[PDB]
Enzyme design. Structure first.
Site, PDB file in Angstrom:
ATOM      1  N   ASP B  73      17.669  23.763  13.705  1.00  0.00           N
ATOM      2  CA  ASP B  73      19.031  23.429  13.375  1.00  0.00           C
ATOM      3  C   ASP B  73      19.641  24.384  12.361  1.00  0.00           C
ATOM      4  O   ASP B  73      20.846  24.646  12.455  1.00  0.00           O
ATOM      5  CB  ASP B  73      19.135  22.005  12.801  1.00  0.00           C
ATOM      6  CG  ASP B  73      18.619  20.916  13.743  1.00  0.00           C
ATOM      7  OD1 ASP B  73      18.697  21.040  14.972  1.00  0.00           O
ATOM      8  OD2 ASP B  73      18.061  19.944  13.239  1.00  0.00           O
ATOM      9  N   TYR B 333      24.954  14.395  21.415  1.00  0.00           N
ATOM     10  CA  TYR B 333      26.066  14.016  20.537  1.00  0.00           C
ATOM     11  C   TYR B 333      27.329  13.689  21.301  1.00  0.00           C
ATOM     12  O   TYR B 333      27.558  14.241  22.363  1.00  0.00           O
ATOM     13  CB  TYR B 333      26.433  15.131  19.550  1.00  0.00           C
ATOM     14  CG  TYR B 333      25.469  15.284  18.374  1.00  0.00           C
ATOM     15  CD1 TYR B 333      24.247  14.630  18.388  1.00  0.00           C
ATOM     16  CD2 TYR B 333      25.829  16.103  17.305  1.00  0.00           C
ATOM     17  CE1 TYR B 333      23.361  14.778  17.343  1.00  0.00           C
ATOM     18  CE2 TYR B 333      24.942  16.246  16.251  1.00  0.00           C
ATOM     19  CZ  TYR B 333      23.738  15.581  16.289  1.00  0.00           C
ATOM     20  OH  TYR B 333      22.891  15.641  15.208  1.00  0.00           O
TER      21      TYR B 333
HETATM   22  C1  SIA Z   1      22.869  20.116   9.226  1.00  0.00           C
HETATM   23  C2  SIA Z   1      21.741  19.709  10.160  1.00  0.00           C
HETATM   24  O1  SIA Z   1      20.578  20.097  10.039  1.00  0.00           O
HETATM   25  N1  SIA Z   1      22.055  18.866  11.124  1.00  0.00           N
HETATM   26  C3  SIA Z   1      21.248  18.310  12.195  1.00  0.00           C
HETATM   27  C4  SIA Z   1      21.215  16.780  12.126  1.00  0.00           C
HETATM   28  C5  SIA Z   1      20.397  16.284  10.919  1.00  0.00           C
HETATM   29  O2  SIA Z   1      19.044  16.700  10.999  1.00  0.00           O
HETATM   30  C6  SIA Z   1      20.367  14.757  10.825  1.00  0.00           C
HETATM   31  O3  SIA Z   1      21.725  14.379  10.847  1.00  0.00           O
HETATM   32  C7  SIA Z   1      19.769  14.176   9.520  1.00  0.00           C
HETATM   33  O4  SIA Z   1      20.518  14.588   8.387  1.00  0.00           O
HETATM   34  O5  SIA Z   1      20.547  16.225  13.278  1.00  0.00           O
HETATM   35  C8  SIA Z   1      20.380  17.008  14.466  1.00  0.00           C
HETATM   36  O6  SIA Z   1      19.028  17.112  14.013  1.00  0.00           O
HETATM   37  C9  SIA Z   1      19.941  15.955  15.487  1.00  0.00           C
HETATM   38  O7  SIA Z   1      19.605  14.761  15.383  1.00  0.00           O
HETATM   39  O8  SIA Z   1      20.055  16.373  16.654  1.00  0.00           O
HETATM   40  C10 SIA Z   1      21.245  18.235  14.725  1.00  0.00           C
HETATM   41  C11 SIA Z   1      21.963  18.726  13.478  1.00  0.00           C
HETATM   42  O9  SIA Z   1      21.967  20.134  13.530  1.00  0.00           O
END
Ligand code: SIA
Ligand code: SIA
Ligand code: SIA
Ligand code: SIA
Ligand code: NAG
Ligand code: NAG
Ligand code: NAG
Ligand code: NAG
Ligand code: CA
Ligand code: CA
Ligand code: CA
Ligand code: CA
Ligand code: CA
Lengths: 390, 390, 390, 390
Positions: B73, B333
């Site tokens: 991510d 999402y």
């Molecule tokens: C900024 C960041 O890392 N965002 C990531 C979030 C966070 O991990 C969760 O919201 C917990 O804070 O979740 C994703 O993992 C997910 O579930 O698909 C994608 C996204 O890129």
């Protein structure tokens, strides 16, 4: 604001001539670097300043790995796309307007109205978009592949008219017309007359008071259903064209259908969408039509004209006006459209030239355009130049 | 110069229908010739004339050689990109706005505001761009992955409003809202109420006085934190949605969390960003929501609606409104957004449909869009049509 | 008409932050489908509404068959190209402005002025273009590679100023400035002072009365020639920067050059173009500078600042303001430019990050951008993410 | 609405310099990822703000599978295409205007007129398009490859003027001029004088009263037919250029055709379209010409100029003005055109540099541009840099 479009008198001229070929698959070789989209049912519609070339894509390019299913007509992937006319419809040049396996679009002088049908066969849905916004829908009324023109709708003073139909491809499909203003259906028009099967109408303005359409009867006849829609009263009547020059494919020999104008005749099962466009003069109207060269196959395309008369009652043969596509080449759907010059309208016919190698390979189409241009006689034909093996 | 944008009453309609599928990897075959970008967290935002399709790219294309790491991510290469909605997001069609691994954007009637977060996990940074210029930044306040919505921010009379959050994905993450005007932060809003964990808020205008958001609690519950933000006093309060139709993934069975609306219940750990969009009618408010079909996996997507009432106190089941994505297809999402028609706003929900083959191959996503149009029932679902082996 | 551009006060802020990476070769894998152009000497210049990213291409793409010769600096094929900043500079996205193996460009508020040098080494030629029209030339005066900035020229009230130089890379190269208005040279300015070797000046506005430039001495010193050009009198004086933080590469250890400010010092042969941009405040001026992390190689890039003082006499060390590129990564040419916000100007530094695999493979560059943005300290560095073997 | 364009005095300058090279096949390598179109007969025409780069494509790209037949001049697939000058003419960058195997285009200050010829050799057809609309046609009058300029037509106050010709390439081909206003032919002009063979005229304005053209005689002489067309009376007269510097290819040695200015001389058979552009000064007229370096082959290209006098009576040698293309490089068709600067016109000569590998491989061309800029001598030549084996 910009003002609404109205049909004007046609530009001066008396013959059509070869204008433009869009042949995307001249760039689709496995060793080339392009991505032409796999399409069928192309049509062109123009606003005051530009024309858009529309088609229903299978959401796949050549070369590519998704050729299976591109010879089917309806599925969850087909989309209505466009490019500015003159551009090659590739993955990056095209705009994807909406999910649709049947389509139409037209400009009213201020904005583009896009029309697409999708949904299950027994319960499909007309969806209308005005510019970017999705604005209205219309439901299946006979529950058997609700579908529309595959060519431009027609707007006058802000009111746009659209043929839709629903019913058996080999039985009754009674069409209706929708009257659409700024993307919303403000009236349903139920035609009267010879109404048992009318689909894929190619429609244009005969005057400020009448829209006329040459349509397909996929079940009962090789004569085309011919609609006369009165725009002032919002009423439509349909009767078969009486000319002995039958415009559908398949069809029997010209003039072989005996009996009154309304007689269905033989070889009526099957059909093809046909080109039709008006040349509006001050005291005369020319009706220009295209039909395949072959009476039974989608091969070749020739042009015919007739000035004045009543299509519903004139049995006279239409006048042959030139070979646009030789017997050697594909002649599939054809359609009319008009380009807006500064003070007058230019009538054109576009021809879908499908690359058919059967169900085993990709299935797509080039689009050839012939427009009214000067005088004399039509001089040259169109070839796609595509070798389907590359 | 242009008028500032305000929320308007929604266009007439009572059901959502399939609108459009952007599936860039239908063109990513190794034998094809295109370069769809590898992306996740797509979202759409619209201005008065045009919508943009945003996403966070891994700065790599399919086919390509940089698939390794595209399932992570955050890293130093992710960027916020966009294309005009309806275009395909390839290397050449896209615009790269800023280095970012979490993002948001919105139009205020005059210009685009772009928000991106990057920096090290323990000390990340909100960066704001207004048009072409970088204008401001906001610092990490909990030193644990400062991050934002992954969907449109919301502007009213020039003031744009944005959820940010910082804190443990497994514990406390108190969000804050930023009030941004012409790219500069002019107010920070500290919410009241149930603030233990709010992230990935999907926000929209319930009226000219209130922004509401359905958010994700990654730690404690499968009920969604629901924000009511008063734009006139710039205050916000958060409480859990009370409906038995729990909108997070993972979730327990509907209605199984016993106790008052605030009980956290079971299977709280984990979450997904959820779709939410308002239908504002003259006398009443429709709140439209999406959730995965599976209770535990990111598969399928169903639409639900509730008219009026209070989300914080109403235990009532939401009304199932149709299957957008079947259980056989990815449903990751989802987000709400509104298209500006001439006189009214069109609510839509977009769905990220990730192609997930695990860490040994590329990881990217299609975007499916459903919007309010016409009456009746939702008729057809969306498939990506992509085979990840090609 | 539009009115002429003038430097304005800088937007509020006190630290730079990572803004944007353009890394074209992330899409240049032999198995990918893209065509990034092979470039070096990128720079950015902005007009009121947009920025263009310029570079000198070798008129070749990756993957491709013309990698030989792309590590040479001058030939008959090199061209000045641009894309809108944010676009990837590929074969189809780029505009080819003119044949040139040295360049500059700038916007005056009404139109783009493009500057390119080509011709034989002993007799090269400055060529100026205003929009589409070629408008003027200037001839070699020392007959040994007439050349220019490799960064934006600077316009005030319609008059644009440009450094040019001519002379031995390892001897005397006395620069001059040209004053250009609507594409035509209206004045030559011959600098006074320490004039024996000045090239590749990075210039910007210190006020409405003074252009300042931090330049390269490729022959005699690792101190940068620093120009002060008075715009009201069209006179220029050059003296070496006195700071013990020597900004050239190669260079000796900071503060090791003994003697008065003008002393040349050791390790003066060789050089690199250096980033420099102004932050103009009401009562204070910040001078922001970049230099490589390595004292002898083109590796890494860090940022320094100093407020007020006189560069010609202050021996004080500049204040380290953050690592933009680690020692691990290429740090080649750097340059300043300003983005125009609505009421203020945003200072930025751009960094050329060259992919060097030697003379045996392709040689090109990514461009990293850091801009003044908010407060605190600089938080993250940039990597190209490119593997040159793919 | 916009003012009609008129010729203006030329911008100050006394020498031509290398301006720009468009070499699309630098990207056509089989291992690259681009699709440059296969073309011949390039030419450029400019409107007030933009220039277009036109050519006649064989509707095939490199790399590709349709190289066979690309060395033929007329067939059913050639089309007139353009891109904005400075862009690369690939499949996706280009616009396809009309089916054509001979062409011309010009801007009248308000809109583009496009001219294309197609049809069978014995009965071809001029077709004219104004913007998007097809507006008129002109018939074959000698039934032997009706054809036109392959360079810009010329408009003054809305009236555009165009050479057409018809007749044997080995005998008589009397040209005619068409006067076109808003896409429609409003006058046919039948020249007087030496009319036995004139084709491929390169025309420009000598003043507001006179258009002059240097043309090709494919049959009888190596001296160029030179047209003086009076725009006020719409009459034209043609006589051979009298200069000893014969501008055709093939040609005898300079000065070797003895006798009066009208003597045809030796090696008359064959020809090439030649560059010609006017430099209009307040008191005098520069006529700039290009011709191949070889007397017999299409190799190299040199620039020549003569101020004032009468081309029909002056035997004087033209003044050699620099080598644009060396003898090692292809020099095929050349053409003149003018770029509109703010207050004055910039004369340029473009050169078609064909990549000719014979009929067993692809056949296409680079375009090199030289324009009047500054003073001195022409400094550098142009190479295509293309290896046809890649
Ligand atoms: C900024 C960041 O890392 N965002 C990531 C979030 C966070 O991990 C969760 O919201 C917990 O804070 O979740 C994703 O993992 C997910 O579930 O698909 C994608 C996204 O890129
Ligand atoms: C909506 C739909 O399926 N349309 C299809 C129609 C109908 O099958 C017939 O008009 C009978 O209704 O015909 C085509 O098959 C055809 O002949 O080429 C193509 C088109 O896609
Ligand atoms: C016009 C020209 O050749 N410029 C080249 C300059 C000059 O060689 C030096 O400035 C000495 O004058 O340096 C480069 O070599 C370099 O260091 O990377 C690149 C640039 O292209
Ligand atoms: C319309 C047409 O065929 N034009 C062709 C002309 C004519 O053959 C000659 O002008 C004799 O008329 O010559 C070319 O062959 C040539 O020399 O390169 C190219 C051009 O395409
Ligand atoms: C149609 O009506 C408009 C005015 O309503 C008029 O300008 C136009 O010329 C008419 N067109 C035809 C074909 O009569
Ligand atoms: C919001 O306010 C604007 C004017 O401030 C008004 O035009 C608009 O219709 C209002 N929207 C709603 C949902 O009431
Ligand atoms: C420069 O001059 C213009 C007026 O000539 C003024 O508007 C601008 O603010 C001045 N800029 C600075 C940095 O003083
Ligand atoms: C031609 O005429 C126009 C006005 O009709 C004038 O402005 C222009 O300068 C004239 N051009 C020449 C070459 O005299
Ligand atoms: Ca039939
Ligand atoms: Ca492309
Ligand atoms: Ca949860
Ligand atoms: Ca040095
Ligand atoms: Ca000859």
């Amino acid at each position: 604001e910009p003002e609404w479009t109205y049909p004007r008198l046609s530009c001066q001229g008396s013959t059509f001539q070869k204008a433009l070929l869009i042949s995307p698959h001249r760039f689709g070789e496995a060793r080339g670097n392009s991505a032409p989209l796999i399409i069928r049912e192309p049509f062109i519609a123009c606003g005051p300043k530009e024309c858009k070339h529309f088609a229903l894509t299978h959401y796949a390019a050549q070369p590519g790995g998704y050729y299976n299913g591109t010879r089917e007509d309806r599925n969850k992937l087909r989309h209505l796309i466009s490019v500015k006319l003159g551009k090659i419809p590739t993955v990056e040049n095209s705009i994807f307007h909406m999910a649709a396996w049947s389509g139409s679009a037209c400009h009213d002088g201020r904005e583009w109205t896009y029309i697409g049908v999708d949904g299950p066969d027994s319960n499909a849905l007309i969806k209308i978009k005005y510019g970017e916004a999705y604005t209205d829908t219309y439901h299946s009324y006979a529950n058997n592949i609700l579908r529309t023109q595959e060519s431009a709708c027609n707007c006058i003073g802000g009111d746009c008219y659209l043929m839709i139909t629903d019913g058996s491809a080999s039985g009754i499909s009674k069409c209706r017309f929708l009257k659409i203003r700024e993307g919303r259906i403000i009236k349903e028009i139920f035609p009267t007359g010879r109404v048992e099967h009318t689909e894929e109408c190619t429609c244009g303005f005969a005057s400020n008071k009448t829209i006329e359409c040459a349509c397909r009867d996929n079940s009962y006849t090789a004569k085309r259903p011919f609609v006369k829609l009165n725009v002032e009263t919002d009423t439509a009547e349909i009767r078969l064209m009486c000319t002995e020059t039958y415009l559908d494919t398949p069809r029997p020999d010209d003039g072989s259908i005996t009996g009154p104008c309304e007689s269905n005749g033989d070889k009526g099962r099957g059909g093809i969408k046909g080109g039709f466009v008006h040349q509006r003069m001050a005291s005369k109207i020319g009706r220009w039509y295209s039909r395949t060269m072959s009476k039974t196959e989608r091969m070749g395309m020739e042009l015919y004209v007739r000035y004045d008369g009543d299509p519903w009652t004139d049995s006279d043969a239409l006048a042959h006006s030139g070979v646009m596509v030789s017997m050697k080449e594909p002649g599939w759907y054809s359609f009319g459209f008009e380009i807006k010059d500064k003070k007058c309208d230019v009538p054109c016919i576009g021809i879908e030239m499908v690359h058919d190698g059967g169900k085993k390979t990709w299935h797509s189409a080039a689009t050839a355009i012939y427009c009214l241009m000067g005088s004399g006689q039509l001089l040259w034909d169109t070839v796609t130049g595509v070798d389907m093996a590359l």
